[PDB]
Write a protein that binds this ligand. Structure first.
Ligand SMILES: Cc1ccc(C(N)=O)cn1
Ligand SMILES: O=C(O)CNC(=O)C(=O)O
Ligand code: NI
Ligand SMILES: [Zn+2]
Length: 331
């Protein structure tokens, strides 16, 4: 078996290898990349997402989210407080202000130490889940707005046409902005391109060990667990690498820099944080190997999760027994 220790693998496709997206995902998996839950892909030197990022300041962040923490430094939840709209230019200025800017630090490890020591004592503001794309329409390779759709994948694999669309989302981050432990909706893949700015550090649990993380989460967030059998779907829980190590949870970490892609694989739990002002673009996608994960994906039906329109068809076709209960949760 390839990659038996479930290490995060890093790939350097040539420009020829960068033409066929599906083929390269399959290649990465042939090398065992999916066992980690996360892979990094460094594009060939000849590639670019767009010409410049000089003209993005007028993009609107309609609902910036202030991420307010509760708990202890290594075990906490965060809730999202809605703030007034601001442009990306205004947001960048805010990120760079004394209140929110990245502190002096020696290296990525030093900054990581500072993040887990001090995150809960601040409430950074995130511009997340903004429908849109920063890929030039003329970028033909790994353009996250031009991928084969999940609906077409399901149709190709299972023969049933379904409603729904899937399009990319933009994320404008600042120091300490945080993404909670989660897998994707319906345990889909995701792909994330860091367009511009400071790095993003990722933590990931191998898919074959995801239930170990779930068991620990139930122990660490007991009220949340009683409220919902799938509460990590709420995407609000954080557990530090120190606490994961203390509890013997297998995981890995890696830092993504501007110009790099990350792919998360079905049922690969991940979490992380931004180092400073940045902009990422991400979208979910599927392959034939996803279908079995989609069929088995556990769902939130307590009402907290609240997902996109397109997930309806996924649950309806892949999980008909669960559909009634799940749909009741969506309403
Ligand atoms: C605590 C918890 C959260 C989410 C899930 C899941 N598989 O969706 C399972 N257990
Ligand atoms: O970048 C973020 O804030 C979160 N991204 C993801 O969880 C992803 O790409 O799957
Ligand atoms: Ni994700
Ligand atoms: Zn729930």
């Amino acid at each position: 078996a390839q990659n038996p220790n479930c290490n995060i693998m890093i790939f350097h496709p040539t420009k020829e290898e960068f033409n066929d997206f599906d083929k390269y995902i399959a290649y990465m998996e042939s090398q065992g990349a999916h066992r980690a839950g996360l892979a990094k892909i460094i594009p060939p030197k000849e590639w670019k997402a767009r010409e410049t990022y000089d003209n993005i300041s007028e993009i609107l962040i309609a609902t910036p989210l202030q991420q307010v923490a509760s708990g202890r430094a290594g075990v906490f939840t965060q809730y999202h407080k809605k703030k007034k709209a601001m442009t990306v230019g205004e947001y960048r200025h805010l990120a760079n202000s004394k209140k929110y800017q990245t502190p002096p630090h020696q290296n990525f490890e030093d900054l990581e130490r500072k993040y887990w020591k001090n995150r809960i004592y601040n409430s950074p503001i995130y511009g997340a889940d903004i429908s849109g794309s920063l890929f030039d329409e003329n970028t033909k390779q790994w353009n996250l707005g031009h991928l084969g759709t999940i609906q077409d994948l399901l149709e190709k694999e299972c023969g049933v046409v379904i409603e729904g669309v899937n399009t990319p989302y933009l994320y404008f981050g600042m120091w300490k902005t945080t993404f909670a432990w989660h897998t994707e909706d319906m345990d889909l893949y995701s792909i994330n391109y860091l367009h511009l700015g400071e790095p993003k550090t990722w933590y990931v649990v191998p898919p074959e060990h995801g239930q170990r993380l779930e068991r620990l989460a139930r122990e660490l967030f007991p009220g949340s667990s009683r409220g919902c059998g799938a509460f990590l779907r709420h995407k609000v829980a954080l557990i530090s690498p120190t606490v994961l190590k203390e509890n013997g949870i297998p995981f890995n970490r890696i830092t993504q820099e501007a110009g790099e892609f990350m792919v998360t694989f079905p049922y690969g739990y991940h979490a992380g944080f931004n180092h400073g002002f940045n902009c990422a673009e991400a979208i979910n996608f599927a392959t034939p190997r996803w279908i079995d994960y989609g069929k088995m994906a556990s769902q939130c039906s307590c009402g907290e999760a609240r997902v996109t329109f397109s997930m309806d068809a996924f649950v309806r076709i892949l999980q008909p027994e669960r559909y009634d209960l799940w749909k009741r949760g969506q309403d």
